[PDB]
Paper text:
Cytoplasmic dynein-1 is a conserved, minus-end-directed microtubule motor critical for cell division and long-range intracellular transport in eukaryotic cells. Dynein, a member of the AAA + (ATPase associated with various cellular activities) family, forms a 1.4 MDa dimer composed of two copies each of heavy (HC), intermediate (IC), light intermediate (LIC), and three (TCTEX, LC8, and ROBL) light chains (LC), with the IC, LIC, and LC known as accessory chains. Cellular and structural studies have shown that dynein primarily exists in a pseudo-twofold symmetric, autoinhibited Phi state incompatible with movement along microtubules. LIS1 plays essential roles in the activation of dynein, including relieving autoinhibition and helping assemble the fully active DDA transport complexes.
Separately, we obtained a 6.2 Å reconstruction of the tail portion of Pre-Chi. At the current resolution, we could not observe any differences between the tails of Phi and Pre-Chi. An interesting feature we observed in Pre-Chi was the asymmetric binding of LIS1 to the dynein tail. To see if we could find a population of Pre-Chi with LIS1 bound to the other face, we revisited the tail processing for Pre-Chi and Phi. We subclassified the Pre-Chi particles and viewed all the volumes. As a point of reference, we looked for density in the volumes that correspond to the IC-LC tower of accessory chains, a feature that is only observable on one face of Phi dynein. Whenever density for the IC-LC tower is present in our Pre-Chi volumes, it is located on the same face as LIS1. We did not observe any volumes with LIS1 bound to the other face. We hypothesize that the asymmetric nature of the Phi tail induces preferential breathing of the side where the bulk of the accessory chains are found, which in turn leads to the binding of LIS1 to that face.
Residue numbers in the entry:
A (entry chain h), B (entry chain g): 110 to 140
C (entry chain d), D (entry chain i): 1 to 89
E (entry chain e): 1161 to 1305
F (entry chain v), G (entry chain k): 13 to 113
Write the structure that this text describes.
Amino acid sequence: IKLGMAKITQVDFPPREIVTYTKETQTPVMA
Amino acid sequence: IKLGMAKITQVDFPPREIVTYTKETQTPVMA
Amino acid sequence: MCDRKAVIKNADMSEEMQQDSVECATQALEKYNIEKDIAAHIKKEFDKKYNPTWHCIVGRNFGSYVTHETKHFIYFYLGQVAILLFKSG
Amino acid sequence: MCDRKAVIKNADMSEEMQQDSVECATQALEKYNIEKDIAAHIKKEFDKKYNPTWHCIVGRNFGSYVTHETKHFIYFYLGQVAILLFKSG
Amino acid sequence: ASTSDAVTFITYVQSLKRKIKQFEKQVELYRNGQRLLEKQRFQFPPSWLYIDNIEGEWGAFNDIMRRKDSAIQQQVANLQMKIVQEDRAVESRTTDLLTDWEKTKPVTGNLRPEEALQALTIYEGKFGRLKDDREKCAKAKEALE
Amino acid sequence: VVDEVSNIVKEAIESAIGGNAYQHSKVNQWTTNVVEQTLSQLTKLGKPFKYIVTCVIMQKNGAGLHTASSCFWDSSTDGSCTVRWENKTMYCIVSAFGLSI
Amino acid sequence: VVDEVSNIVKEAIESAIGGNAYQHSKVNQWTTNVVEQTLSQLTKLGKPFKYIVTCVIMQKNGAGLHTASSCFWDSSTDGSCTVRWENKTMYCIVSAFGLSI
């Protein structure tokens, strides 16, 4: 069977990453 | 040609194990 | 009055989420006379509102440094308790 | 230095992760007395040995309810400061 | 994954971190100043945070910027690979377009000067855009690791 | 027909899963049911095609799936039908195929 | 051959994806390269069959996976091969179904 040229239908589902939005603030003890 | 019901490769992926609950904790108290 | 409020020091969250977290912490602290029981009530409120599982760290002395996700993070003081609660997932 | 003896009265976490975190906490307490730095080091060690993400908090007068994953919420106190490495997820 | 945009963001993040070194040095000096104020009782009014409150907000912003820089450093290799592939494909397409326009400029009888000039300019723009895109992707990868 | 194959796949998904979520003990069963429904839809048409129906179900846990179906089939006689149907917490990218017999 | 097809699919998955750092813009390219390599290996085999290849590539993020294909052919002269391959934190599964013309 002489099959013709065929491509591939690409459908990549999306992932979700991790947000490294660190809230930096030094925490002191009671004074 | 002839065709009918048959079998296939049965592959399934079990998921990871984790436990989530509202468990209360506390730090020790000193003076 | 036991006010678990905050000022603009480090508060990176949705406004409704931060207000709900502060109100839930204050209500749990008012309802429960123990710190652990107040933590349990606040965690129940968090798992009911923002779904399971969410935790809040609040106390006189504390410290937090983790992957604080956007619109669900906090690092401040709520009254005598240091409100450092960040939700990621 | 500092008596960084982690006595886990309640250890609902992995033994290997808890031991690695305890060793890192002892090293960090020998390095410095900053409880926030010790908690950050414990959280970083737990997140490195058990993937993202892990959160650890060290304080004196605080009450928090751990909303974490199974076998990853280690509450080991080096004395009285309960360094609860409740890896949320 | 888009190499040009990723490299531009990486170079911008590198410049931002170079400035943020001095910005955070000033932030540490200001945290010390706010602490000294609170020692003199000059903690900031509770409408916003104190001097340490502005310091905590700046620390949150710096944590976000450091997270962006860490993501850039993690994905720099993939961004560079995507940019190199896109630049090579665009340059091959620009070569094909330049050759095709030079071979078959629109040289018909009426308005054929404008049509042939447009075809030649389209081929030249394709080649130059491919070259510029490749150069920009490489420069952004260099500026963003 | 690719449009008919996609419509049959969508109807089978609506009839079997529809708004059903993802369960570990039932994902493979749902995939088998969807594949069987697609195979029955392809066989009942009477077209002389060696129909192949593939069903893959993923969980919406931050995982993306790249779905494709390329086969050594004739361009003017055969083809493949790989589509994706999305749910709230059940990702299902399923493919139907047909080769001239 | 089922074993030969599984070995070729494993070699293609190793050559395409491997166990390197994950990338959404590169996972689809790896899946496409694996599909092209599998198609080339099937075409160079020379056996009288019309293979149908479905490559399922996923990332390890707690999502369940069930890559299955229900078809309509003859098991005496046609068959399919299943190979379990993956990465350090990603999956590389190809479902190849060789069908006699």
